[PDB]
Each structure stands twice: as structure tokens, then as C-alpha cells.
């Protein structure tokens, strides 16, 4: 009778949590930025580490009694350093947003200009992608030379191709800017060698730990520069946060141990392979993909040549048990609330054990639906077939660990 | 249990168990510490960590949010009931993010904030007088001189009731917002053991662990619909992305407990226990800031002593009691050394201590501070306290 105390005490929450597990098991999760956490990561999250208030850093805490949490945090930091092969890591950020805020606070001053990708504490300017779905680095260079930002940021949620960190660094160097790489969406590939590292090109790198690394939700910051490391540490605490979430930090350490394993490289490679199958099938079925394929874990479909919208596609897929998300595309002609595109990713399906054959099956069904997007009976039928298919790939026997 | 973790990552498994043993064997008296409910921890280690839910219930960026929307709605509704307010935001990742959200909602970068003292905005401060209480006329003249756009009240080491009405009167005189950060007293407030900041504060923040025994995290509350909208926008997408859904479910569970009859009993015992601690220390001839307390904490002053707050903190630590050094009115030492000691009762109360046990521990504290360099006494008391602690165990395991 697992979590029987919760069931007796707060049956509503208990029931809702099990329904969410049922939803994760029965449907196909193809939101590019989602993944399935390890049971071992979840086990340590529901722990008495939540009771410890540990403001400061290991060996340098504000309160006493931190002998064991200091060892836990040190383990997280050391594994993070090994994973990214870097000299400094901060594992305290509560989220990707706080990680990025910490980097900004460390590197620039309020009011300073940031140049970032688009697909008031600081001044923002943006670069984007061309109609062919790729960054034009000469244009970025031109934008940088005219705007003169103090900081250039790279990384994006819906970019299907390799980010050329070396070119970004060449550009930053021309105008004397810092280069900050936010690799939250591709970090799991980076640590496996399935995407080039942002080091040594980025001065500072941030990531989240759940999306691609399959750890708990949270942020991390990495650097090789000791002075920047000190500034990052101060910016996170006391600058932006108080005491860290120690149960999450322990969870991060557990996740990193998995990321360091041989199994991780196998997983990361399969993520890319699965995305290749997804892309190839959709294109063979005569759908347009932004950039005509992918280098990573995601595909972005374009419906500029089609009858239906991105929101239409998202809702049809949803009705067939497939969770994705509408997304704007280059040459966009519709409201950002409607879009003419759909983003799909493979990390979560790969995590539950889908391989090329399963990807081909799902990809063809996606195609079937979008070939007949108004046929609600077709969606119902596919929903049942997919629930059956998914029943062979169950990674969670329970909702709480 | 947690056998899978034990097999996969023995180092983390072992360290987590050692931390459990430390919490069991020691006497936790850091005023801001507490013990989370087992039921809260159960839902924290759940598959809700897997859902990305940017936005608010019924208005998310992603589909598939049917069930997490119902969870967050439940947390919001329970929070509104607990604080008797018309709007709540339960997404803040921490007290720090909650407060940043409030600043971002109410004022502009560079604007001035007046807050309590013991880059984005300008900060000014008021403090406490030698008698250990806020002089509200002094606060008023600071406010008139500085003209902040926002006044903040709430403090981590203030032992007396905060006069929210007077703070609002001061704010009104200068056309400022009043923000009450009640993280350190929220558990007393929701039980009626401290006056509510509403309707005096425009916006109220709190954390969910310290005094409410929920998970670590933040919340924001208001009665003003226009401010609620600004608050929600500030939190997302201003300050955060996706919320921690496993934590939001945990906050909901915690609120359910806070709403129960047992909560009021707990909160009253917290105050009673703090009265015992205060009375014993003063009977033993120690000075307390403001000569007592109205809440969960006491602040000892050592201006009349040869040892520092740091010395006291280390002496208690050696005897197995966790506390923290703290500056005091009339402070004469570095703030990294201090002339005081903050002590609180929430954690000991949570594990079942009542008056009799408080009297034992308070007299041990007095014994130590009467002979601060007596290392053997500390060792002996540590032994006695471990025995006392063994009779008050609330966790049978480290992971739920």
C-alpha cells in the first residue's frame, strides 16, 4: 500500500497524481522539452533533506549542522564538473530562469544590453532564423556590430540544428562581449558527445537538469573562469536566492551519476536516431520540416503550404493521444496564438524505450492524422492503437517513489 | 526502503540517512527550521516532476494539463481559505522568488524600497530600538524623508507582534504600497495566534516550510484583483518559467494540514513553548531582546557578557543544539561575530516537545552559557539531550 498515508490524508491530491501517471503511461509524450525522471531521482526528492536550511556554499554555510548536506552538494558539484569537463559548477539554481538570472547578474549591470535568440531589468535585442530555418551568422554579426551588446546569449527551444558556438564566440570577440550558452534544451546530447560542447567558446554555460538530462527540475551554471565562478556564486546567493533546495540538489547528483554512465551515451544516441526516423518519415509522407530535417532531438513542421494551422494540428494529435505543441515558423502568417507549425521531440519516448521501429509507427500515424486533420474518428482509433503500443513501454509502476 | 536508490547511488543514499540521524539525535532550535509532514514528502517524490506546465490553470502553453491544473487549483483554493484572501499565486520556487515577483509587480527597476534591518532597486532601512521594539514614529519619519514606492515589513528575528495597521498608515501618508513578508510567522497567523496582515498589506508573501511545515517554496497573496494580475505576470513569464508541479502538489497537502483543527493546537503549543523558553532563560538571569516574546522565537542579548553570539552558537552546537548567532540592538561587535543568539520552538514543537521538555532544554542552555568554555559539560549535556530526543521521533525513515 504505497503512499497509503497520503491516500488516507489527502485522497484528492493522491487521486490526481495517479491520474497524471495514467496520462503519462497511456499517451505519447512528444513535447520536445519534456522527459521522464529516474525513479532513483524521485526517491531522494521525497526525503528529509527538505528540512535542512543550508544558505551559503559547502564549508561556508551560515548555519551549523551542515556536515552531510555539504557532502551531498559537493558530490553534485563534482559530478557536474566531470560531466561537462569544466572547472567550476554551481548546482544551487532553483530553475533554468534563476540560473540565467544569476549569469546576467554575474556578468553585466542592470540596464545593460543583451543580444539573444527569438523564435525591464536589462535591454534586449534579438536575432532569429532565416526562411530556411537556420541562423545566418553574418546577420547576427551585423546585428551585434550595430547594437553593441555587453552579452550575447545562444541556445533556443525550437532550433532543430547544431548551434555553432565557435561562430558566436568569434562574433562576441569582435565587439568585446561575453558569450553565454544556455544549453538547457540540448545538454543531455552535449554531455554524451552527440552535440558539440559550448566549451571553450562560451565564457559561461547554463542548463536545466530535467529536460534533456532526465534529472529533477532545476538549474545549473558552469564555467572555467575562477573570477567568473566567484561572481556567479555571489549572484546566486545572496543575490537571487536564499537557501537552496537540498532534496533537489541530492536528486541532481543522482541524475548526474546516471548521465556519467555508459548507458547515457546509448540513450543520447537513440534520442538523435529516433528524431532522424521521425524527420525522415514525415518528409517521405510529404510534410515540410523547418530546415528540412534535424541535428538533434526535435523536429519542427511547417504548415505554410497547408490548409490547417499549427493549433489545429496540435489539437488533432492531442485527440489521438499524442501531446505536442503548436509553434510559429519562419515566414509565419498567423497569430502567435495560432501558429503555422508544430514542434515534436523524442527524448521522452526514447526514455520509455521506443526505438526506430516504434518511431516509424508513430510517425506514420502522425502523418495519417495530419493528412485528414478533421477526421475525429481516425484520431479516436489511433488513440486506442497508441495506448496499446504504449502499454509495452511502461517505465513507472507507481506514481510516487 | 528506497532500495533502488541504495543500489544505484549508495553514497547519496547513505548521506541522506546520516542526515536523518542528525535530525533525530540533535535538538533543532534554529527559529526558521521545521519538520515537513511525511505526506508532503510522499507527493514530492512523484511523477509530477515530469510535467512542464508554463502558464496558469486553464491558460497553459501546453496541452495535457488537465490534472496538474486541478492540482494547482486545489493549492490556490486552499491557500485562499487559509489566509482568507481573494487571490493566491502558489508558483514561486522560493521565498526569494516570491519577493522578487512582488517587487516586479508593484514597482520599477531603480525604485526605492524601505525594509526592516535586523542592484535592481534602491534599498533603505528602519530598525528596532534598544527596548527591542519597532519605533513606528521613527519609521514614519524615515518614510517621509526617503519617499520609497514600497514599504516592506516582516523580519526573521523580531520577537513581537508587527503592527500592520501602523505600517499601512505610514505607507498611505507617502502613497507607497505595503508589502508584508510573513514567512517567519505565517503558521501563527493562519491559526489566529498572530494578527493577519490583511487588510492592511496590499500584498503578502510567505514561504511554505518554516512555519507551515509544507515543502520549501514561496506563495503570494492579495485581495486586489489588479495587483493579482500584475503578480501573476511578474511570476510568469517575468521571474520564472514552468512551476515545480511536484512542489505545488506538496504545498496543497501542507495547506490541508494547516486548515485542520490539529494546526491550531500546534500553533498554540509553539507559542506556549516559546514562553517557557523565554521565562526560564530570564529566571536564569539572561537578557532577552524586548524582555520576552509574543511569537515563536527569543533573541538573547550578550552585551552584558564576555562571550559573543558566535561563542554561544558554537557552545550550544557542541552540546547538540542547533541555533544561530544574531546581532542585537546596541550591537558592539562585528555582524559576523554578533552579541546575540536567536532560538525558536517550531521544530521541537513539531516533534512533540511540550512545557516539561522545554524547561529541561532551556535550563541546559542556561547551564552551557553560564560556563561557555566548559567543553565537558557540553559533552555531558549532549548525551542527556540525545536521550531526551530518542523519545520524540517523528520519522521512521529518511525517504517517503
Swiss-Prot record, chain A:
(6S)-5,6,7,8-tetrahydrofolate binds at residues 119, 227, 335-337. Catalyzes the reversible interconversion of serine and glycine with tetrahydrofolate (THF) serving as the one-carbon carrier. This reaction serves as the major source of one-carbon groups required for the biosynthesis of purines, thymidylate, methionine, and other important biomolecules. Also exhibits THF-independent aldolase activity toward beta-hydroxyamino acids, producing glycine and aldehydes, via a retro-aldol mechanism. Homodimer. PANTHER family: SERINE HYDROXYMETHYLTRANSFERASE. The record marks 210 as: Plays an important role in substrate specificity. One of its GO terms (molecular function) is pyridoxal phosphate binding. Keywords: Amino-acid biosynthesis, Cytoplasm, One-carbon metabolism, Pyridoxal phosphate, Transferase. GO terms for cellular component: cytosol. Belongs to the SHMT family. This is Serine hydroxymethyltransferase. It comes from the Bacteria. Its EC number is 2.1.2.1. Pathway: One-carbon metabolism; tetrahydrofolate interconversion; Amino-acid biosynthesis; glycine biosynthesis; glycine from L-serine: step 1/1. InterPro entries: PyrdxlP-dep_Trfase, PyrdxlP-dep_Trfase_major, PyrdxlP-dep_Trfase_small, Ser_HO-MeTrfase, Ser_HO-MeTrfase-like, Ser_HO-MeTrfase_PLP_BS, SHMT-like_dom. Gene3D superfamilies: Aspartate Aminotransferase, domain 1, Type I PLP-dependent aspartate aminotransferase-like (Major domain). The gene is glyA. One of its GO terms (biological process) is glycine biosynthetic process from serine. The modification N6-(pyridoxal phosphate)lysine is found at residue 211. SUPFAM superfamilies: PLP-dependent transferases. Its cofactor is pyridoxal 5'-phosphate. Pfam families: SHMT. The keyword Transmembrane helix does not apply. It is found in: Cytoplasm. The keyword ATP-binding does not apply. It catalyses: (6R)-5,10-methylene-5,6,7,8-tetrahydrofolate + glycine + H2O = (6S)-5,6,7,8-tetrahydrofolate + L-serine.
Amino acid at each position: 500500500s504505497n503512499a497509503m498515508s497520503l491516500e488516507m490524508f489527502d485522497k484528492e491530491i493522491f487521486d490526481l497524481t495517479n491520474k497524471e501517471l495514467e496520462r503519462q503511461c497511456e499517451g505519447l509524450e512528444m513535447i520536445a522539452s519534456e522527459n521522464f525522471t529516474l525513479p532513483e531521482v524521485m526517491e531522494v526528492m521525497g526525503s528529509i533533506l527538505t528540512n535542512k536550511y543550508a544558505e551559503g556554499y559547502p564549508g561556508k554555510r551560515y548555519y551549523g549542522g551542515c556536515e552531510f548536506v555539504d557532502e551531498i552538494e559537493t558530490l553534485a558539484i563534482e559530478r557536474c564538473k566531470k560531466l561537462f569537463n569544466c572547472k567550476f559548477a554551481n548546482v544551487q539554481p532553483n530553475s533554468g530562469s534563476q540560473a540565467n538570472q544569476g549569469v546576467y547578474a554575474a556578468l553585466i549591470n542592470p540596464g545593460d544590453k543583451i543580444l539573444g535568440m527569438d523564435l525591464k531589468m536589462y535591454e534586449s535585442c534579438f536575432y532569429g532564423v532565416e526562411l530556411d530555418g537556420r541562423i545566418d551568422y553574418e546577420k547576427v554579426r551585423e546585428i551585434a556590430k550595430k547594437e553593441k551588446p555587453k552579452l550575447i546569449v545562444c541556445g533556443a527551444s525550437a532550433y532543430a540544428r547544431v548551434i555553432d558556438f565557435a561562430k558566436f564566440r568569434e562574433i562576441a570577440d569582435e565587439i568585446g562581449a561575453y558569450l553565454f550558452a544556455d544549453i538547457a534544451h540540448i545538454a543531455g546530447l552535449v554531455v554524451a558527445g552527440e552535440h558539440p560542447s559550448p566549451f571553450p567558446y562560451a565564457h559561461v554555460v547554463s542548463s536545466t537538469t530535467h529536460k534533456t538530462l532526465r534529472g529533477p527540475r532545476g538549474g545549473i551554471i558552469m564555467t572555467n573562469d575562477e573570477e567568473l565562478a566567484k561572481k556567479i556564486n555571489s549572484a546566486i546567493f545572496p543575490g537571487i536566492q536564499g537557501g537552496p533546495l537540498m532534496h533537489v540538489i541530492a536528486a541532481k547528483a543522482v541524475g548526474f551519476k546516471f548521465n556519467l554512465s555508459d548507458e547515457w551515451k546509448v540513450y543520447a544516441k537513440q534520442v538523435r536516431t529516433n528524431a532522424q526516423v521521425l524527420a525522415n518519415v514525415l518528409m517521405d509522407r510529404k510534410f515540410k520540416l523547418v530546415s528540412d530535417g534535424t541535428d538533434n532531438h526535435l523536429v519542427l513542421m511547417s504548415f505554410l503550404d497547408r490548409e490547417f494551422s499549427g493549433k489545429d494540428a496540435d489539437l488533432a494529435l492531442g485527440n489521438a493521444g499524442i501531446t505536442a505543441n503548436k509553434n510559429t515558423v519562419p515566414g509565419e502568417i498567423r497569430s502567435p496564438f495560432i501558429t503555422s507549425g508544430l514542434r515534436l521531440g523524442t527524448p521522452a519516448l526514447t526514455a520509455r524505450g521506443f526505438k526506430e521501429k516504434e518511431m516509424e509507427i508513430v510517425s506514420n500515424y502522425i502523418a495519417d492524422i495530419l493528412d485528414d486533420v478533421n477526421n475525429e474518428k481516425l484520431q479516436e482509433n489511433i488513440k486506442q492503437e497508441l495506448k496499446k503500443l504504449a502499454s509495452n513501454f511502461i517505465i513507472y509502476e507507481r506514481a510516487m517513489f
